[PDB]
Amino acid sequence: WRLWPSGPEGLQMVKKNFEWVAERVELLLKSESQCRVVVLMGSTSDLGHCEKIKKACGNFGIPCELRVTSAHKGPDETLRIKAEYEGDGIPTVFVAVAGRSNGLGPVMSGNTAYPVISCPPLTPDWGVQDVWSSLRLPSGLGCSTVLSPEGSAQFAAQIFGLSNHLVWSKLRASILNTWISLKQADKKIRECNL
Amino acid sequence: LNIGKKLYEGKTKEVYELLDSPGKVLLQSKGKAAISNKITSCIFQLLQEAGIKTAFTRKCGETAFIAPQCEMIPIEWVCRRIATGSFLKRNPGVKEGYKFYPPKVELFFKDDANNDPQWSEEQLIAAKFCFAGLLIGQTEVDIMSHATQAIFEILEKSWLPQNCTLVDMKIEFGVDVTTKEIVLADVIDNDSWRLWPSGPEGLQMVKKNFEWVAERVELLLKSESQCRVVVLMGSTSDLGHCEKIKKACGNFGIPCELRVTSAHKGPDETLRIKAEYEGDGIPTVFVAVAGRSNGLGPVMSGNTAYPVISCPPLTPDWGVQDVWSSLRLPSGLGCSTVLSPEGSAQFAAQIFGLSNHLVWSKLRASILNTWISLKQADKKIRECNL
Amino acid sequence: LNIGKKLYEGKTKEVYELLDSPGKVLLQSKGKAAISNKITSCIFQLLQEAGIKTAFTRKCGETAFIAPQCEMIPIEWVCRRIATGSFLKRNPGVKEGYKFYPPKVELFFKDDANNDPQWSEEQLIAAKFCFAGLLIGQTEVDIMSHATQAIFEILEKSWLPQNCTLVDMKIEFGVDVTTKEIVLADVIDNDSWRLWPSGPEGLQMVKKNFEWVAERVELLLKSESQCRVVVLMGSTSDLGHCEKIKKACGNFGIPCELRVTSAHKGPDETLRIKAEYEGDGIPTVFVAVAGRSNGLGPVMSGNTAYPVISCPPLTPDWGVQDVWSSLRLPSGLGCSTVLSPEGSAQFAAQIFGLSNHLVWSKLRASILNTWISLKQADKKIRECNL
């Protein structure tokens, strides 16, 4: 490869010498950007939903914690837990999981300057009625919605990826590999068009 | 090898029994009688491949063909698109050339070389005929007239590419002794129909001579229009959905290929695959199968001048929410939606049918047969209203 | 009458000014040069009627044609479907016959009879050319390559019925001094392309000689495939809806008729009207427009072997409730749904396009032009990101 110094601007432009490159390459294996995803669930009966998010976060190397809190039952407590993730300086993304009327996501988003994803555990029974409590929020709420549990973890990854190259890389490799997989399935089904 | 007894016969052929094979235990035999058999062997194979229930098995020699044994209906069904000769004489005022659009179906009583009149569809019912056990009434008389019109249109279409106009035709039915179905049971040669030259315009108008007709009929068994249906699926987990479409396409004789591609994942690849079906000149129709938000259909339609059908694999779980991504498309998209997998194959067939008479024929026979089926279910449930 | 000054010229023609008519103030003049003008006059009229922006007004005499004045782009665009000659020599390994599917577009730097090399699409942008005021960069270079491929495919299609294979072609653009649009600005004769005989199979493969090409090109201006769109409306109060479809059909050169019929009120009549479009042999597509519960589309589709599009005149008041009567049909119905009135006309066009190259061409040009339009809106809004 060829690596400019990039701090058209420097000398005639000189590739870094194998010596300098040598004592830097190990640093590419680590990132300056710390990141954490905190999953808030209004009820432990959605624990399974939250775990798919946690496991997914695990695929992008992002630490993830699950917690139980109710905007409707312990309003005060939800804010408290919010504060201990805000006050410890770790860049965090909140994923709100609340069934039925979701007031957890809306409240979180309204009291924190960090991103907040509402990832409702919808089922086709009343799903069509419940999503709207996560969409349609009063003004001043950046709160975003993502239905897929792993999908919400992915979005969180892409958020942190803007600062953690190690995470960005995993997103990129994944994009590629999914294409590789598409390519192969088509070739394998193409065999059967004889 | 071959056997035979006695049995009946018509004016052009002599039907013989066939020991060593009951049922289809019939042989039709009968200068230029070999021409008459070559013609009747194609029209039959043709009408048969289209889907019309017809008394014909395989061709046999030069002047013969075996077919299932059946009791004939003593009636001559005639269908017209244009009025000429006889008809004119019978219908004063109708100037020659008058086109009938449904088109006109008339039936003549007992073939008897005496007067063999014209019967009303009501005199046939009151006739109370019964062959091979089948009492002929409303339902049966209705089937024959409908089937006659259908057979007409099929042959009318089949001929057009040879630049021939089917003016009118004569046809006789018969109840299959085995299956008990009313079938197009008797030879169709050059005296069974009348073909103008259609390139009111030519000479005094001369029916094609059995010679010219002879060396053209085999061409009706093939089509100039090539056609292909390509099924694009965003995910192999819908493979089953796509196969119902493929199998359906198989019912209309249209070649169909399944392929995997994602507008969302491999945008670039979808366009690539699109290009190799566009560039090879085979007239193609694309059927897009994408679950959830369907962006496959919309993208395809927007980048190809060929038709694109979106056939979403909906389930009642979230179906009502997903269809709208296939309907409601930004302007400039001809993309059409069809929910039924086989239904989408049928639509594709009807698209290609505009150019492939063989496909059109299958669509037409199917329309008829479905009616035959409706008719019978009603008669079978009618029995239970006693 | 006619005038003229000096101006520029190419290898086959000499461009002259034309006082008494500015702008289109250009005349192209130039044995067999009259053949070269007859060919270039059809291909242009053809590409123009298809929708391609091309520098051509009317034919003039035997060896001339007037067109709008424009500054030429010193680049030779070439498009290939099959690799032959030159290309092979430039691309070692590509065996003759290799088919390119997108298909391949290459452009050659300044026409200069010296070496006139091959430029990368990136060397043209860096060239920073500017004609008639139009600085040529990403956007413009992208338009020409896209337009070249589109022009190729159109001509490729147009030729097929004459049993000719467009192997590759050469084309030059130019910015119209008036409108400032990049247009197919310069003659296309028999040395602008290469046409196999395509009935790897024939002789060593010989391009058609300008003589044979000459007496065929006018045939590309007409199609063998006839087509008609019939719009059925259950109520005259939707007349406006049906007219958008009719007008749209007009944009693709497809004849379209509006008619009033009710599946619910005159069941019998609907079938009758259906029959007179079926019986007259004109390939037809039916577009059903019925508000509320749509039984018109379903019934039509079930009684005709031709395609049937349901194009409901929905309004947001009860639209969500009505569409389902057009979707969700009993089995055996190929009936397709398309909400957009013009969209349904477009789909119909794409159906007929499978057989009418003139229609296919209009669809293709349209695809291109819509892209050209997208490209320009982005560049115009990009200006406002300063």
Side-chain angles (χ1 to χ4, degrees), chain A residues 28-88:
Chain A
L28 299 205
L29 289 179
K30 291 178 173 292
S31 182
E32 278 287 70
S33 289
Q34 276 207 62
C35 46
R36 170 181 62 193
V37 174
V38 169
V39 170
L40 292 305
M41 68 178 87
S43 170
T44 45
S45 53
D46 286 312
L47 203 244
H49 187 262
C50 305
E51 285 171 319
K52 289 186 191 173
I53 307 181
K54 184 160 182 286
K55 196 256 207 55
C57 280
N59 287 315
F60 296 118
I62 307 181
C64 166
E65 304 171 26
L66 311 183
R67 305 216 48 187
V68 176
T69 176
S70 185
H72 304 297
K73 289 306 174 73
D76 65 323
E77 241 289 53
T78 304
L79 299 184
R80 192 183 75 61
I81 296 187
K82 165 188 69 75
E84 53 191 51
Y85 281 110
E86 292 169 339
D88 83 338

Side-chain angles (χ1 to χ4, degrees), chain B residues 10-12 40 43-44 47 72-81 86 90 104-108 110-112 116-117 144 147-149 151-152 155 166-173 184-195:
Chain B
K11 254 288 73 182
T12 172
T40 208
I43 296 312
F44 275 16
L47 301 181
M72 306 284 210
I73 316 289
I75 301 276
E76 269 174 49
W77 298 77
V78 180
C79 189
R80 299 164 179 299
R81 173 65 73 184
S86 170
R90 300 188 294 90
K104 275 295 296 306
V105 165
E106 302 180 303
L107 55 315
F108 299 146
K110 43 303 316 300
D111 316 19
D112 67 302
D116 66 4
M144 289 181 275
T148 293
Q149 198 180 309
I151 304 181
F152 183 85
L155 299 180
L166 179 58
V167 182
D168 50 36
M169 76 171 327
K170 205 294 308 298
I171 272 185
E172 297 181 18
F173 294 93
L184 197 206
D186 185 278
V187 59
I188 294 182
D189 57 27
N190 196 44
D191 289 301
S192 299
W193 61 34
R194 185 179 314 160
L195 297 173

Side-chain angles (χ1 to χ4, degrees), chain B residues 81 99-103 153 156-157 160 225 272 275-285 301-309 314 319-320 323-324 327-328 331-340 343-344 346-347 349-355 360 363-364 367, chain C residues 81 99-103 153 156-157 160 225 272 275-285 301-309 314 319-320 323-324 327-328 331-340 343-344 346-347 349-355 360 363-364 367:
Chain B
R81 173 65 73 184
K99 286 201 171 68
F100 294 107
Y101 279 97
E153 291 169 43
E156 186 176 18
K157 189 71 69 178
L160 272 208
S225 289
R272 192 183 75 61
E276 53 191 51
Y277 281 110
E278 292 169 339
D280 83 338
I282 297 295
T284 301
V285 157
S301 185
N303 293 279
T304 167
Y306 286 149
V308 169
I309 316 291
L314 313 167
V320 158
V323 287
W324 293 98
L327 317 166
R328 306 271 309 169
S331 82
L333 297 183
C335 202
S336 76
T337 307
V338 171
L339 304 177
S340 184
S344 67
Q346 187 168 185
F347 191 76
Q350 303 165 326
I351 290 182
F352 288 124
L354 286 167
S355 265
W360 158 280
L363 258 16
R364 257 257 54 163
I367 288 182
Chain C
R81 173 65 73 184
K99 286 201 171 68
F100 294 107
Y101 279 97
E153 291 169 43
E156 186 176 18
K157 189 71 69 178
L160 272 208
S225 289
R272 192 183 75 61
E276 53 191 51
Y277 281 110
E278 292 169 339
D280 83 338
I282 297 295
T284 301
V285 157
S301 185
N303 293 279
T304 167
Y306 286 149
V308 169
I309 316 291
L314 313 167
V320 158
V323 287
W324 293 98
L327 317 166
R328 306 271 309 169
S331 82
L333 297 183
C335 202
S336 76
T337 307
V338 171
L339 304 177
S340 184
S344 67
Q346 187 168 185
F347 191 76
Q350 303 165 326
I351 290 182
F352 288 124
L354 286 167
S355 265
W360 158 280
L363 258 16
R364 257 257 54 163
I367 288 182

Side-chain angles (χ1 to χ4, degrees), chain B residues 105-108 110-125:
Chain B
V105 165
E106 302 180 303
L107 55 315
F108 299 146
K110 43 303 316 300
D111 316 19
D112 67 302
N114 331 328
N115 41 159
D116 66 4
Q118 178 177 180
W119 265 16
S120 84
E121 203 180 63
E122 285 94 329
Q123 306 182 313
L124 215 191
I125 300 185

Side-chain angles (χ1 to χ4, degrees), chain A residues 122-124 127-128 131 178-179 182-183 185-187 189-190 192-193, chain B residues 233 239 257-262 265-266 268-269 272-273 317-318 321:
Chain A
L122 313 167
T123 80
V128 158
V131 287
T178 301
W179 151 284
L182 243 176
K183 266 290 195 175
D186 182 38
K187 182 145 78 78
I189 190 173
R190 218 184 306 146
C192 319
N193 292 300
Chain B
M233 68 178 87
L239 203 244
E257 304 171 26
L258 311 183
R259 305 216 48 187
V260 176
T261 176
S262 185
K265 289 306 174 73
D268 65 323
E269 241 289 53
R272 192 183 75 61
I273 296 187
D317 272 336
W318 298 91
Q321 287 62 44

